[PDB]
Design an enzyme around this catalytic site. Structure first.
Site, PDB file in Angstrom:
ATOM      1  N   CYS A 286     128.436 -15.049 106.118  1.00  0.00           N
ATOM      2  CA  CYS A 286     127.706 -13.965 106.286  1.00  0.00           C
ATOM      3  C   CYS A 286     126.848 -14.354 105.313  1.00  0.00           C
ATOM      4  O   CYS A 286     126.671 -15.379 104.447  1.00  0.00           O
ATOM      5  CB  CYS A 286     128.641 -12.705 106.329  1.00  0.00           C
ATOM      6  SG  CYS A 286     129.390 -12.290 104.894  1.00  0.00           S
TER       7      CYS A 286
ATOM      8  N   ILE B 256     131.203 -12.912 101.568  1.00  0.00           N
ATOM      9  CA  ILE B 256     132.053 -11.476 100.786  1.00  0.00           C
ATOM     10  C   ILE B 256     132.188  -9.819 101.853  1.00  0.00           C
ATOM     11  O   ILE B 256     133.330 -10.132 102.130  1.00  0.00           O
ATOM     12  CB  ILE B 256     132.474 -11.389  99.769  1.00  0.00           C
ATOM     13  CG1 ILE B 256     130.630 -11.169  98.899  1.00  0.00           C
ATOM     14  CG2 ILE B 256     132.353 -12.408  98.847  1.00  0.00           C
ATOM     15  CD1 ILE B 256     130.614  -9.676  98.159  1.00  0.00           C
ATOM     16  N   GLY B 257     131.515  -9.769 102.111  1.00  0.00           N
ATOM     17  CA  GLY B 257     131.039  -8.607 102.721  1.00  0.00           C
ATOM     18  C   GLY B 257     132.049  -8.911 103.717  1.00  0.00           C
ATOM     19  O   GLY B 257     133.093  -7.783 104.343  1.00  0.00           O
TER      20      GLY B 257
END
Length: 284
Positions: free
Chosen positions: A219, A223-224
Site C-alpha cells: 500500500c 505498514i497500514g
C-alpha cells in the site's frame, strides 16, 4: 521479544465478537503496542531520499530486503524500502512488506520480485490512489527481465494480472492482485471483500506448493493496509489451527519485523471485524 516485549491476548469466539465492538478497549490496547519505527538517521546513504516515499517510514535494518544484484556492496544500489515478514507460527519470509513503488523505485521493485522469486503481489490501493503504475499495459523490460502481462481478470473487489517474467532460458509466473475495495470507513459491513482477498491469496499461495517464495504486499507506505492484510492472513490460519485468534500478539510480531504495521486504531478495529466475521463463517 527482541526489539520490545511482545504482548498477548488470546480471544475465543465470544470475546472476539465482543472485543471487535469495544472501541474504547481497542484503542487502550492498540496505543500500548510499540511502533518500533526506525530513526531516519539510521540510514546514512547519499541518494537515499529518492528511494523513500515517506522520510519517517523506513525498513528496520535487521529484516530489510537487500538487493544483491548487481552490487551487493553499494548501500544505495542494494536499498529498497522493504522488510521480510514472518507468517503464522513465525515461518521466516512468508511475506515482504514494502512501499508502493515510486517512479525512481520501479526498476528496484522488479529487481526484488526477481531476486525473491515472488509468485504473488498484493497491492491494496484504490483506483483513485498513492502509487505509481509499475507494470506495463502489455510488455516491458527492466534490468534484463521481460515483464509481460498475459491477462487481466476483473472481479468485484480486485483485478488479477497474470504476468510472465523472463530472463535467459528461464521464466516464471506472477499473480498480481490489485485490491480496489479498501474502505474509507472501517465498519463491519465493509469487511467481507478483504476477507475474500485474504482467502483467495492464501489458496493461491498453497497452490505454489512447499516453501512458497515471499508474497509481496504493498500500500502507500507498506505498514497500514499492508499490516491489516498480513495480520488477517496470519489470524485466519491461527483460527483454523487453534480455534482462537491473538491479533495483539500477531500485531506485535509484525511490528518486530517492520515498524508501524497496522498504523491506525481504525485499522486495528477492522482486523477484529474481519476476524469476527470469519469465525462466524467458519462455524457453518
Amino acid at each position: 521479544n527482541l526489539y520490545f516485549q511482545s504482548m498477548s491476548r488470546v480471544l475465543q469466539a465470544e470475546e472476539l465478537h465482543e472485543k471487535a465492538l469495544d472501541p474504547f478497549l481497542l484503542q487502550a490496547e492498540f496505543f500500548e503496542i510499540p511502533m518500533n519505527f526506525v530513526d531516519p538517521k539510521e540510514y546514512d546513504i547519499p541518494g537515499l531520499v529518492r528511494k523513500n516515499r515517506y522520510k519517517t517510514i523506513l525498513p528496520n535494518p535487521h529484516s530489510r530486503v537487500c538487493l544483491t544484484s548487481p552490487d551487493p556492496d553499494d548501500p544505495l544500489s542494494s536499498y529498497i524500502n522493504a522488510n521480510y515478514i514472518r507468517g503464522y507460527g513465525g515461518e521466516e519470509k512468508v511475506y515482504i512488506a514494502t512501499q508502493g513503488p515510486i517512479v525512481s523505485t520501479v526498476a528496484d521493485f522488479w529487481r526484488m520480485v526477481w531476486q525473491e522469486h515472488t509468485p504473488i503481489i498484493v497491492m491494496i490501493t484504490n483506483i483513485e490512489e498513492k502509487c505509481t503504475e509499475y507494470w506495463p499495459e502489455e510488455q516491458v523490460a527492466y534490468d534484463g527481465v521481460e515483464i509481460t502481462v498475459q491477462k487481466v481478470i476483473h472481479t468485484e473487489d480486485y483485478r488479477l494480472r497474470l504476468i510472465s517474467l523472463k530472463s535467459g532460458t528461464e521464466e516464471r509466473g506472477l499473480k498480481h492482485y490489485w485490491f480496489t475495495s479498501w474502505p474509507d470507513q472501517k465498519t463491519p459491513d465493509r469487511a467481507p471483500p478483504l476477507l475474500h482477498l485474504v482467502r483467495e491469496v492464501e489458496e493461491a499461495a498453497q497452490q505454489e506448493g512447499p516453501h512458497c517464495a515471499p508474497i509481496i504486499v504493498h500500500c502507500s507506505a507498506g505498514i497500514g493496509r499492508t499490516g491489516c492484510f498480513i495480520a488477517t492472513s496470519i489470524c485466519c490460519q491461527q483460527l483454523r489451527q487453534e480455534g482462537v485468534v491473538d491479533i495483539l500478539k500477531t500485531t506485535c510480531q509484525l511490528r518486530q519485523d517492520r515498524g508501524g504495521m497496522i498504523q491506525t486504531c481504525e485499522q486495528y478495529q477492522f482486523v477484529h471485524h474481519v476476524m469476527s466475521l470469519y469465525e462466524k463463517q467458519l462455524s457453518h
